Amino acid sequence: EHIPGTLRFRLSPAARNILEKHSLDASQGTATGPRGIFTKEDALKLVQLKQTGKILEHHH
Numbered sequence: 001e002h003i004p005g006t007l008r009f010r011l012s013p014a015a016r017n018i019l020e021k022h023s024l025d026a027s028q029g030t031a032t033g034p035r036g037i038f039t040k041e042d043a044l045k046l047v048q049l050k051q052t053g054k055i056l057e058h059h060h
Helices: 013-021 040-059
Strands: none
């Protein structure tokens, strides 16, 4: 879908702030904004996935 190595230029500033705050890897997400931009909502899906890992570990 995208040219390799372009994710760091397609990250929105909102996403980049959320990924850094939570020490997340954007390459585990998908870019769903127009023309391949990785949006705030795309980074929040990675926050929800990290929370899911912690919640399941706690129930295990």
